Amino acid sequence: SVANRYDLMNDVMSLGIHRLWKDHFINKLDAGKRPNSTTPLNFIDVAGGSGDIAFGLLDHAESKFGDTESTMDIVDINPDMLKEGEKRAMEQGKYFKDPRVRFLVSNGEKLEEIDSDSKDIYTVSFGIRNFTDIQKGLNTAYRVLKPGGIFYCLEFSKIENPLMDFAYQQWAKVLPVMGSMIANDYDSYQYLVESIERFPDQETFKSMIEKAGFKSAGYESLTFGICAIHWGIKV
Amino acid sequence: SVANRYDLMNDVMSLGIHRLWKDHFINKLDAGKRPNSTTPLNFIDVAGGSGDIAFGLLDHAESKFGDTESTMDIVDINPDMLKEGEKRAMEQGKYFKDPRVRFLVSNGEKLEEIDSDSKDIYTVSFGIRNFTDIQKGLNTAYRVLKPGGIFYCLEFSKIENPLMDFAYQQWAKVLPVMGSMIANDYDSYQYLVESIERFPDQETFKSMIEKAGFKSAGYESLTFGICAIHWGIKV
């Protein structure tokens, strides 16, 4: 199971703390059809096929706003990931065979199957660092949102403090060595560490988001900047 | 959820490989009433109240031998761990409210509620290193088992590959540091590292097993001795 591996890797990298970042990410977004409204919202979640963010967005909308009508497209380029999503949906007995929830194979940079100006909320969580073309992803995220749409991102970022950054770098050195020796999994851990290293820092990423067309771009650094929430608004 | 924290920490320490050590442990024991036999086995599993190993032992017996009769005493000194085991059993739809499987609170070093010479298989999986008196827990294992009973133990051990040892030493230094920085939890990770360091090596632990009175004792080192399986047979 590929999704089991990503979960494992995320748990190892962040010592389980990514679960709390995600909880925060959802709470902060505070998205959903208000009891004062009759228009249901249209969600899209990209590059998290196994669905922990998508389901949590939906769960949050239900328990806090009574929203049970908002739709959700869960999109990933990896079919295996979406398969694990559906399986988890079946096993938890929620969002499996649900008209509201669609699982779709699609390239995160193109999203051809999705209509321009169709979406209200776009989320990408710990996936965008692996896009071969990050800007094209952000541009594409601009396309599919409606005016007044919100782009929300959770991704690894840059640690500001030198002492913490130094510790993290030693952690990033040892991680692929341990993986190799213990799990014959050098390549996976090396790619993970490199994709974090290569990812733009808070300010650079915010600019790339404004360059895509989004306005009132901001970010909140979490756990000293080991990761960050970025946002944007379409026109 | 105390059981999920142990799971998380085991995943992090072993990079998920403890799951494979656990499968190998169950498969190597190969316990269960054979089809040309009519005698159910009486299993006792100590200090794994969540029931990871106990459920797996029962599953293995059923899928491989058709054994649906053997009994299992899941024993843990922590009622919260057993509580999680019962919750998992209910959510699985297996081993919950099931006369075959008892969840019992008891100090694993004493097992006072457990009768002498009543068990066929004793298993302890990543628990015995945290016994305040290990020899006492071994003697108790000897007591509860029948003549011919098997003591089977999965535990961290002494690494026997110098290169793996060198990598591990770096790992054990930086891990609790990440615990401090990311998890605000130095203590748990350092306690884990120290608990492993204080455990007897393969040969010393074998001796202790023999000291308890077990015969034909042995061990198999896993992943260069990062952990090991130890066994003993009652008289």
Curated annotation (Swiss-Prot), chains A, B:
EC number(s)?
2.1.1.201
Q: Primary place of residence?
A: mitochondrion
Task: Determine if Nucleotide-binding is one of this entry's keywords.
Answer: no
Any one Gene Ontology MF annotation carried by this entry is: 2-methoxy-6-polyprenyl-1,4-benzoquinol methyltransferase activity
Stretch forming the signal peptide: none
Where's it found, cell-wise?
A: Mitochondrion inner membrane
As its record notes, the protein acts as a catalyst of: 2-methoxy-6-(all-trans-hexaprenyl)benzene-1,4-diol + S-adenosyl-L-methionine = 5-methoxy-2-methyl-3-(all-trans-hexaprenyl)benzene-1,4-diol + S-adenosyl-L-homocysteine + H(+)
Tell me which GO cellular component terms the UniProt record holds: extrinsic component of mitochondrial inner membrane; mitochondrial inner membrane; mitochondrial matrix; mitochondrion
What's the superkingdom here? Eukaryota
Q: In which pathway does it act?
A: Cofactor biosynthesis; ubiquinone biosynthesis
Would the keyword Mitochondrion turn up in this protein's UniProt record?
Answer: yes
Subunit and interaction comment: Component of a multi-subunit COQ enzyme complex, composed of at least COQ3, COQ4, COQ5, COQ6, COQ7 and COQ9. Interacts with COQ3.
Q: Which family does it belong to?
A: Belongs to the class I-like SAM-binding methyltransferase superfamily. MenG/UbiE family.
Protein task: Methyltransferase required for the conversion of 2-hexaprenyl-6-methoxy-1,4-benzoquinol (DDMQH2) to 2-hexaprenyl-3-methyl-6-methoxy-1,4-benzoquinol (DMQH2).
Q: What name is this protein filed under? A: 2-methoxy-6-polyprenyl-1,4-benzoquinol methylase, mitochondrial
The gene that this protein is the product of is COQ5
